[PDB]
Amino acid sequence: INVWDIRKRDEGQLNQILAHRNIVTQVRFSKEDGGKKLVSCGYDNLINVYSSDTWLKMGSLAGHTDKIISLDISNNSHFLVSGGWDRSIKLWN
Amino acid sequence: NPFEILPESIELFRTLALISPDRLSLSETAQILPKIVDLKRILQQQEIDFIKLLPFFNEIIPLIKSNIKLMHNFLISLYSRRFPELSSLIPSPLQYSKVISILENENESDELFFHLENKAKLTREQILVLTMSMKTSFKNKEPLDIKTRTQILEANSILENLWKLQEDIGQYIASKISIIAPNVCFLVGPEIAAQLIAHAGGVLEFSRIPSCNIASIGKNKHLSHELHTLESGVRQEGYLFASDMIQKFPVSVHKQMLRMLCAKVSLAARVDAGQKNGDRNTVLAHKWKAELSKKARKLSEAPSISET
Amino acid sequence: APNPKAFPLADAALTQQILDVVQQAANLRQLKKGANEATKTLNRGISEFIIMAADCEPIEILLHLPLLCEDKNVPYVFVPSRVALGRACGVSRPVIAASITTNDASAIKTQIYAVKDKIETLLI
Amino acid sequence: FTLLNRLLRLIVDPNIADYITAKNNVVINFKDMSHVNKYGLIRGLKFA
Amino acid sequence: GNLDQAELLVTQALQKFPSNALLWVEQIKLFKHGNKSSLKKTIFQDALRRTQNDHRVLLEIGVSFYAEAQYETSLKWLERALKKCSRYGDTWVWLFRTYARLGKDTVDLYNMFDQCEPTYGPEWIAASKNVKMQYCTPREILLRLM
Amino acid sequence: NGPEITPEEATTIFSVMVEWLESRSFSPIPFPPLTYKNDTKILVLALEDLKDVYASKVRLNASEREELALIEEAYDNPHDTLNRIKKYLLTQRVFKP
Amino acid sequence: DFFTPATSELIFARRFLINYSLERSRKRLQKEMERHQKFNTRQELLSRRTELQRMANLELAGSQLVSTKPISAVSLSTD
Numbered sequence: 001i002n003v004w005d006i007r008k009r010d011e012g013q014l015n016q017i018l019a020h021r022n023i024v025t026q027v028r029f030s031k032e033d034g035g036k037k038l039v040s041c042g043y044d045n046l047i048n049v050y051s052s053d054t055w056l057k058m059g060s061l062a063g064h065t066d067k068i069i070s071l072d073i074s075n076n077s078h079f080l081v082s083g084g085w086d087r088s089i090k091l092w093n
Numbered sequence: 094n095p096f097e098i099l100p101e102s103i104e105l106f107r108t109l110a111l112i113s114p115d116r117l118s119l120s121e122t123a124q125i126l127p128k129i130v131d132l133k134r135i136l137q138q139q140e141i142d143f144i145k146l147l148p149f150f151n152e153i154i155p156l157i158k159s160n161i162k163l164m165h166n167f168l169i170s171l172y173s174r175r176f177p178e179l180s181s182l183i184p185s186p187l188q189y190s191k192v193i194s195i196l197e198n199e200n201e202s203d204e205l206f207f208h209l210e211n212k213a214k215l216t217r218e219q220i221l222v223l224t225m226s227m228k229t230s231f232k233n234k235e236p237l238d239i240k241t242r243t244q245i246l247e248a249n250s251i252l253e254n255l256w257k258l259q260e261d262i263g264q265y266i267a268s269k270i271s272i273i274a275p276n277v278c279f280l281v282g283p284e285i286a287a288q289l290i291a292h293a294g295g296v297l298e299f300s301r302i303p304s305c306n307i308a309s310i311g312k313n314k315h316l317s318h319e320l321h322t323l324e325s326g327v328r329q330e331g332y333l334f335a336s337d338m339i340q341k342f343p344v345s346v347h348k349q350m351l352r353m354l355c356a357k358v359s360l361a362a363r364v365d366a367g368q369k370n371g372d373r374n375t376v377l378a379h380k381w382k383a384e385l386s387k388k389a390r391k392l393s394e395a396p397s398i399s400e401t
Numbered sequence: 402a403p404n405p406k407a408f409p410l411a412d413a414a415l416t417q418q419i420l421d422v423v424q425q426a427a428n429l430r431q432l433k434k435g436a437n438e439a440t441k442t443l444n445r446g447i448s449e450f451i452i453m454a455a456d457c458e459p460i461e462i463l464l465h466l467p468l469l470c471e472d473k474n475v476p477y478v479f480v481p482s483r484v485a486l487g488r489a490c491g492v493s494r495p496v497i498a499a500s501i502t503t504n505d506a507s508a509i510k511t512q513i514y515a516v517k518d519k520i521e522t523l524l525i
Numbered sequence: 526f527t528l529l530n531r532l533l534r535l536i537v538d539p540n541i542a543d544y545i546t547a548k549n550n551v552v553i554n555f556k557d558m559s560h561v562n563k564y565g566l567i568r569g570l571k572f573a
Numbered sequence: 574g575n576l577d578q579a580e581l582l583v584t585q586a587l588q589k590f591p592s593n594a595l596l597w598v599e600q601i602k603l604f605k606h607g608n609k610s611s612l613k614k615t616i617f618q619d620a621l622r623r624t625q626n627d628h629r630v631l632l633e634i635g636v637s638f639y640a641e642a643q644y645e646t647s648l649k650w651l652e653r654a655l656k657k658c659s660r661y662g663d664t665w666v667w668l669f670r671t672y673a674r675l676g677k678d679t680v681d682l683y684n685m686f687d688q689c690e691p692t693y694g695p696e697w698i699a700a701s702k703n704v705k706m707q708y709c710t711p712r713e714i715l716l717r718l719m
Numbered sequence: 720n721g722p723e724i725t726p727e728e729a730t731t732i733f734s735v736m737v738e739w740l741e742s743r744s745f746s747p748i749p750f751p752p753l754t755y756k757n758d759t760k761i762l763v764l765a766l767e768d769l770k771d772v773y774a775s776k777v778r779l780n781a782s783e784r785e786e787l788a789l790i791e792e793a794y795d796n797p798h799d800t801l802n803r804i805k806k807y808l809l810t811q812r813v814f815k816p
Numbered sequence: 817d818f819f820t821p822a823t824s825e826l827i828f829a830r831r832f833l834i835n836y837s838l839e840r841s842r843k844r845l846q847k848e849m850e851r852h853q854k855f856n857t858r859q860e861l862l863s864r865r866t867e868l869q870r871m872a873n874l875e876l877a878g879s880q881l882v883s884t885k886p887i888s889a890v891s892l893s894t895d
Contacts, residue, residue, distance in 0.1 A: 023522050030867075034851075037867060043521060049871040051864065058868045063876030066474075066585065067521065070890040077867070080874065083887030085474060087578060091877035107574075111606065114642045115674055159607045166642035170674075205726050217721045218527045224726045225531040228734050300465050301444060302611070303437040317543035318530050320550050321812060324561050328813060359437065363465035377459060444612055445619065446584050471885045474581050505591045505623070527722065528729055535740055538750035544808050552816040559816070564722075571765075578881050 015055050020044035026071045033077050041071035063090055095135045102128045106156035114167035129254045136261055151295030157259050161186055164252045171245050178226040184314030188214050190252045263291045276361035276378035281336050288332045300366040304359035327351055342389045350389055357381045403455030403481055409523040410479040420489040422516050425509050426501050427491050433500045434490045442500040443469050449501040450476040450517050454483030457497045476520040576603050594627040601633040628658035644675040659689045662697035666718050759797055766790050
């Protein structure tokens, strides 16, 4: 995940992140929280979470037997709703 | 009410289709024939909203096949040990049920003429071997139970009505195949295309069928006592072998025209499965039909004589 | 470009690797050529993955398969040239669709899982 | 072959009988002409 | 009841574990429902190639043919399952069901059963877990299973 | 025009044969077992009956050499030949011209 | 070609976009102004670690099968 800070154009633009074993499918932000929390999904079976500053892995989210092709975050950031080649929507509480 | 009646009906076909044969569940079984008549009237005069109805048939008709097959296996499960050769000699469940009702009619020459008229699908030789089994096997003793006689009469009724429903779907699809699968229609014919799609259910599924298995679709069940080998040498027979595209060319080429023909039918049905319902072009099946014509005329024309 | 419709389509390098696996499994008898035998492998479910051809015409006859591949959840790619594909399958006549099947005793199994993994990368 | 075949099903395992009639139904060939024998016994067979 | 995701999970579970028999058991059940029933005998052949004629797979063959009403074929497959593994009890259950429908004499089967003393299988273990059949003779266990 | 035999005639004559086999109490001939007692000797009789023609001519043609080759392979491998024979009796309904 | 099209329908909309993104740029950056003005390390870092701990403590809640093929698009509606 290439996190580009475009507020600084000539210095420290990119903060690179190592997301998933295989490629990255969808990336989302914590929305109403004012960002500061990111959530990413990819063809690795894990859905992982990040912060807007450290940009590090806080934890890995299991629950997908197979590829994770889509992800979306609740506006209030409480619950996560995703879908994948498992052909089933999933929640996180 | 079609959308109200139909899902519950398909659910019923799932229930009894899941019910194993030799376990009768007669009360639950008789509840199908009201839904059979219901689907007959929904099908016959409605002629409205086909586009929604096509996937519904693609769903139900395989369940209809497994269901009539189930009634067949349960029915022979009823006739077991009384006249066991009847399944081996009579392949079809329709011929099976009707001919059985005829053996249980009891009401000689009127019998030989009567199963020929009522069954109507029985060839002379089939009648011959059937009569052989009547002498060497059929017990001609009164049935074990009159309640068993009423049970098998009921099974005859539900199997007959169910087959009439399948044939009705075959006629309705037979009407709409022009817009359904235009390539297969132009390539073979409306009736035979309707029989292929009818036996294979969804056009998607008939595209999921390889070209090698299409030739045997519709083939009367292979029977070791019946003769097979023909001068054309074709062992598949079946629907497509009865098409004009084959039968117009000489006896030597029927085999190659059968293999090539089944291939082009598979490809054509795959194109029709890929195309939207609104925009369809027959040009592919057209140039393929031209190619098959070239193949048949080349295989028909022998090689020119060599200089001695 | 080899048609607007057909997707995904690999590059020259990955195409080279995939065709290498095509010839290899073809030497191990783990491959099934043709659209009909590809369909049979998909229905049986023993297919590791599906290769198809971009330059083939018409494209629809190869476009019936991707629906079946997405049904069985099996990966598939499009090599650009059917001539190169069948040439890799060991047939002079150009082949459109080939299928790498499953063998638990196969020595190339790891190669098939690697190439298959890159295919799943392409699928999207 | 139908009557004959049943009469053989009386004698032998119907596998053997169906083999017999299946062998009596073949493509008979002479020079540049070919047909099938549907009707009548083929004498050249050993079990004939 | 929806067998689509079941088929998917079977395919993936075979990709990870082709050798295990129980997966081919559940798949043979899926194709036993007959939503397709196009590829069937070839799926039995594949199950016998992968599982190498496992008694569970053979049993599932005899249960599928049991749902095809043919007690000669299903009886044959159940007997083959006996020869592979005797101590597996579901074989005996589906036996006494098939002999119950066809009508053959079961006495020798009771003899080989008392010689067998089978405890194995999901249905049999379930019988032991029903707590009413906890301590009782295997004969009346079978009687209550039928 | 179909088979000349009518179901009435077939009924009568087949009833005659069945009534005869029942009156004589004739046990039907079983398919040859996997292991049959006189099996090898029966195979010998067949092969010798086939070699009866070829013991004479000193000059064999191609087809005769193929047949005699088959027969010699039948002496060399009776188990493989007998199993090849039982396979055809159980299976093939389609034969070469 | 570079800068070739006129796009008449665009200019009327594009000026609505310079007004729109202009005012929401000033308003948004003003919210940022109040935020960076009023934060501090204590409830900033503690709340941050709290939320991150929550996400790290999330676990699969439920799942619902939908379609015969995989589910490509998953989007939560507003609220």
